Amino acid sequence: MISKINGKLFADMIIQGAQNLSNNADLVDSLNVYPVPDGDTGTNMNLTMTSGREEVENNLSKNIGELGKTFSKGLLMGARGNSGVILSQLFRGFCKNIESESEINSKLLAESFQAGVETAYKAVMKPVEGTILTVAKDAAQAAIEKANNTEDCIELMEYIIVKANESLENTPNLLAVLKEVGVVDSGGKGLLCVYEGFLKALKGEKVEAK
Ligand SMILES: Nc1ncnc2c1ncn2[C@@H]1O[C@H](COP(=O)(O)OP(=O)(O)NP(=O)(O)O)[C@@H](O)[C@H]1O
Numbered sequence: 001m002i003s004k005i006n007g008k009l010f011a012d013m014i015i016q017g018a019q020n021l022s023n024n025a026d027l028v029d030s031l032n033v034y035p036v037p038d039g040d041t042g043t044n045m046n047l048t049m050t051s052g053r054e055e056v057e058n059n060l061s062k063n064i065g066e067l068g069k070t071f072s073k074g075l076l077m078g079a080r081g082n083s084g085v086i087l088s089q090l091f092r093g094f095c096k097n098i099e100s101e102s103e104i105n106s107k108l109l110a111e112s113f114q115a116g117v118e119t120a121y122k123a124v125m126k127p128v129e130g131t132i133l134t135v136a137k138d139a140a141q142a143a144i145e146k147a148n149n150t151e152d153c154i155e156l157m158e159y160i161i162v163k164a165n166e167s168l169e170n171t172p173n174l175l176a177v178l179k180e181v182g183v184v185d186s187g188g189k190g191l192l193c194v195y196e197g198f199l200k201a202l203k204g205e206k207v208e209a210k
């Protein structure tokens with residue numbers, strides 16, 4: 001089990017999350033119908049996440065707060081598209097919440113997801129439901145509920161992914177174009193890919209590069 005996440009474990013989460021998103025970028029692109037069906041959400045999120053990953057790999061730290069500053073900076077100066085901007089804002093708020101910590105427990109992990117949701121909603125002038133914002137929000141609410149009785153960050157992250165997937169599968173019930181075309185939200189799918197990589201890293205595993 002994982003009771004605390006130090007800066008290197010967070011770096012691994014970032015690296016494996018980035019790799020899993022990269023592997024799925026074409027799939028996420030194939031779903032992009034909203035706002036414009038320009039087929040680029042996966043590429044946009046991948047480029048954004050890659051900018052964060054590259055900064056992290058070049059500047060590792062045992063201290064999670066310092067590593068988060070590095071990740072946040074990389075995302076924010078490489079954010080591409082509506083989805084990449086939102087992704088960068090989710091993680092800006094997440095990392096700000098832990099800036100002074102050396103390691104975090106499951107409760108602070110959950111609180112940091114929630115802080116990211118708040119930052120991202122405030123950054124978008126006209127939020128629309130059925131989107132990456134909804135999936136992030138539902139994931140963070142699940143994280144808070146579960147972490148209150150779950151010390152193990154692996155078990156917590158597994159639950160977050162279950163609930164984030166339920167939210168993603170519900171996106172067509174909130175956003176008409178998704179139901180009419182027959183897809184889930186592309187931004188939300190990209191976020192799930194990052195979270196799945198987070199889980200691999202928490203388990204000490206590696207995402208195979210495609
Ligand atoms: N107003 C919004 N509120 C919430 N999420 C949004 C909003 N606008 C876009 N998104 C998210 O961004 C995803 C699309 O991202 P992306 O394909 O990178 O946009 P884009 O191609 O840069 N912009 P556009 O050409 O105007 O569609 C959607 O699937 C949603 O998850």
Ligand SMILES: [Mg+2]
Nearest residue numbers: 036038040081
């Ligand atoms: Mg575009």
Ligand SMILES: [Mg+2]
Nearest residue numbers: 032038040041
């Ligand atoms: Mg697009």
